[PDB]
Design a protein around this ligand. Structure first.
Ligand SMILES: Cc1cc2n[nH]c(=O)n2c2cc(-c3ccc[nH]3)ccc12
Length: 269
């Protein structure tokens, strides 16, 4: 940090990651911008192992819809991760509250989200916290999946394992996390992508959590798409959401079948 901070301006805070605060750093000579995630390992006894794992997963990644990882180093009890600066900001800030964004924009972002998730799943990694705060944008509005603090390996070579950790952000979590002791990784990420699509199209999360005790979730199970947020969503993308937000993960649409969906393939304005 010492010589680094002589040559690089830590201009401002960008946000909070799973494991630490992220700063914009700009080199005074070249004006290169990088995002620096600063992780205080004293915040938990397991933080050193947890951040080591985030680093390890980052080293596996190379895809146009995933935030680039440049490197890392430790200074005392602080770990520094050096990440792509995504100058388009968070997808969250393209969503007008209670309105969403135009359907063509939501469709394009959703295609890019699928590309990134397909990539991750192909290498056996699940993100586990997909939400608009963790979907950044570059200078050409290309989506970049961000923050692998909660990510884990669900397939070792061609051998899947079940997961059991209740992690993620509650309004985005799939119902099987509240019902099953162990579950498949991929349908959990598919579900959160559906909640992201809902938010992009209507500017509103549909429920606190996907429990039968949550009235808004019961309303969706009972096909009450005449209520918000659903009544704001056109029938074509709503038909896709009906296939994604399926309670039984075994019956839930898979990404290869999302690719065949009418709305997914629909030419928009
Ligand atoms: C939390 C976070 C992590 C991150 N890693 N790389 C990045 O650019 N960011 C971020 C960038 C922004 C941003 C706001 C405006 C332009 N950009 C915000 C948060 C992050």
């Amino acid at each position: 940090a010492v010589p680094f901070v002589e040559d690089w301006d830590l201009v401002q805070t960008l946000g909070e990651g799973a494991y630490g605060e992220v700063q914009l750093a700009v080199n005074r000579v070249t004006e290169e911008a990088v995002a620096v995630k600063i992780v205080d390992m004293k915040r938990a006894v397991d933080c050193p192992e947890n951040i080591k794992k985030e680093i390890c997963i980052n080293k596996m990644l190379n895809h146009e819809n995933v935030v680039k990882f440049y490197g890392h180093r430790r200074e005392g009890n602080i770990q520094y991760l050096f990440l792509e600066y995504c100058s388009g900001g968070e997808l969250f800030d393209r969503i007008e509250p209670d309105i969403g964004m135009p359907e063509p924009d939501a469709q394009r972002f959703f295609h890019q989200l699928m590309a990134g998730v397909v990539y991750l799943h192909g290498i056996g990694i699940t993100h586990r916290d997909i939400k608009p705060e963790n979907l950044l944008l570059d200078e050409r509005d290309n989506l970049k999946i961000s923050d692998f603090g909660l990510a884990t390996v669900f397939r070792y070579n061609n051998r899947e394992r079940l997961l059991n950790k209740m992690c993620g952000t509650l309004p985005y979590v799939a119902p099987e996390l509240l019902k099953r002791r162990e579950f498949h990784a991929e349908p959990v990420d598919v579900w959160s992508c559906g909640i992201v699509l809902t938010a992009m199209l209507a500017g509103e999360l549909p429920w606190d959590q996907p429990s039968d005790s949550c009235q808004e979730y019961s309303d969706w199970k009972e096909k009450k798409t005449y209520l918000n947020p659903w009544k704001k969503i056109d029938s074509a993308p709503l038909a896709l959401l009906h296939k994604i937000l399926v309670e039984n993960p075994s019956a839930r649409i898979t990404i290869p079948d999302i690719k065949k969906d009418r709305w997914y393939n629909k030419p928009l304005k």
